């Protein structure tokens, strides 16, 4: 029904990486409960499962590095990955296989983990205001680590005209920007705000795009 991954988005080399999947509204004694990874290069890797009996299955190469455990009570299952290396950077997903399909049908949103000995830096957020019927505004999200950052406009109510660009690393820090395009009579006739989040550094920022 519903899956949510959670855990540190930044783990240091040689430490154990540890994630939790949370299942809302159907029992983890009903199916096969999987972890899958996606690398920065974009290839996918199946990691393993715990079946509803507490029976586990591991990608052979991860056999000795990987644990999958459950808590029958919490309706949540865990991934432990030892002795982590830079090549364990990936966005990690939990996902479900029902008897209905025998395929991987229910997917958590994924959670980025970066394995790196660099240090969390929160972002700076700067409003991007003009110096036509359509108008274009932006937000600059500068100087953070590690990924990810989410960005929304007016809590997600504004969404159609939006470009959020992928981050770019330079000198160990990321920068990213986001553009939004509205009728030039729904601003500044109506407020428009960007909502940046950088969970890693627990930052949550609203910025009103102010004219001039």
């Amino acid at each position: 029904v519903q899956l949510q991954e959670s855990g540190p988005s930044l783990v240091k080399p040689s430490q154990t990486l540890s994630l939790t999947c949370s299942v809302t509204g159907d029992s983890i004694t009903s199916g096969y409960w999987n972890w899958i990874r996606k690398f920065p290069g974009n290839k996918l890797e199946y990691m393993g499962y715990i079946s509803y009996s507490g029976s586990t299955y591991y990608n052979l190469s991860l056999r000795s590095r990987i644990s999958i455990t459950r808590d029958t009570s919490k309706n949540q299952y865990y991934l432990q990955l030892n002795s982590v290396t830079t090549e364990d950077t990936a966005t990690y997903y939990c996902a479900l296989i029902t008897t209905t399909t025998y395929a991987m049908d229910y997917w958590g949103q994924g959670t980025s983990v970066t394995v790196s000995s660099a240090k969390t830096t929160p972002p700076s957020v700067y409003p991007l205001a003009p110096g036509n019927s359509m108008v274009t505004l932006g937000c600059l999200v500068k100087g953070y680590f590690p990924e990810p950052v989410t960005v929304t406009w007016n809590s997600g109510s504004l969404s159609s005209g939006v470009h959020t660009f992928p981050a770019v690393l330079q000198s160990d820090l990321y920068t990213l920007s986001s553009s939004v395009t509205v009728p030039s009579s729904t601003w500044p006739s109506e407020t428009v705000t960007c909502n940046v989040a950088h969970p890693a550094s627990s930052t949550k920022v609203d910025k009103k795009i102010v004219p001039r």
């Binding site: 974009n42 996918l44 199946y46 600059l140 500068k142 470009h163 660009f165 553009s179």
Partner: protein, 213 residues
């Protein structure tokens, strides 16, 4: 061992026309009168959506422009007719032979008519100037095709730039690009006019946005 191998690596299909993507398996994925080969769509920023299960059954909620044929080591996902939401990477998955794998993906790109970019330039915020820095930003938005170039010119003259590109838009099939020049509050304050120039297939000549400090 098994290995799944998709083909082609990438294709470009016109709105309305046919996409076909192959997945060959190393060895049969069959079991109990069933092919344990499943299809997936993945977009940047989100997880893979189950497309087709057991080779040929469409998953609940999924359009019907999407069809899956094939049997043993030989499978085909067909998207007919292609719409704009389909730009994405497609993966086949096998989960019946040790060990489970995905294919290397196929990148579906939609084709559409050439389109010129909306360009906009933004002075640095005062927030950023409160602190030591000054960033100037150009958005080059909603252009086709992806290829494009940017030049920064200060008081007329052409370090400090960082470029990012979106993936193909899922409603109008455009690409966009962001560019941001970075400087010190003192070096930016030493000049007046600031300019980015976008050049693209669509016009012989560059689109030009500018302002004076």
């Amino acid at each position: 061992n098994i290995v799944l191998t998709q083909s082609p690596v990438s294709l470009a299909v016109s709105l309305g026309q046919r996409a076909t993507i192959s997945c060959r398996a190393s060895e049969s994925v069959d079991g109990y009168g069933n092919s344990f080969l499943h299809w997936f769509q993945q977009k940047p920023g989100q997880p893979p959506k189950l497309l087709i299960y057991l080779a040929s059954n469409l998953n609940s909620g999924v359009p019907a422009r999407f069809s899956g044929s094939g049997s043993r080591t030989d499978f085909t996902l067909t998207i007919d007719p292609v719409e704009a939401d389909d730009a994405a990477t497609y993966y086949c998955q096998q989960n019946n032979v040790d060990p489970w794998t995905f294919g290397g993906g196929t990148k579906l790109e939609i084709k559409r008519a050439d389109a010129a970019p909306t360009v906009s330039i933004f002075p640095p915020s005062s927030e950023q100037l409160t602190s030591g820095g000054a960033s100037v930003v150009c958005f080059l938005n909603n252009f086709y095709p992806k290829d494009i170039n940017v030049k920064w010119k200060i008081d007329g003259s052409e370090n400090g730039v960082l470029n990012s590109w979106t993936d193909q838009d899922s409603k109008d099939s455009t690409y966009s690009m962001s560019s941001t020049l970075t400087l010190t509050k003192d070096e930016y304050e030493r000049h007046n006019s600031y300019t980015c120039e976008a050049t693209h297939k669509t016009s012989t000549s560059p689109i030009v946005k500018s302002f004076n400090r």
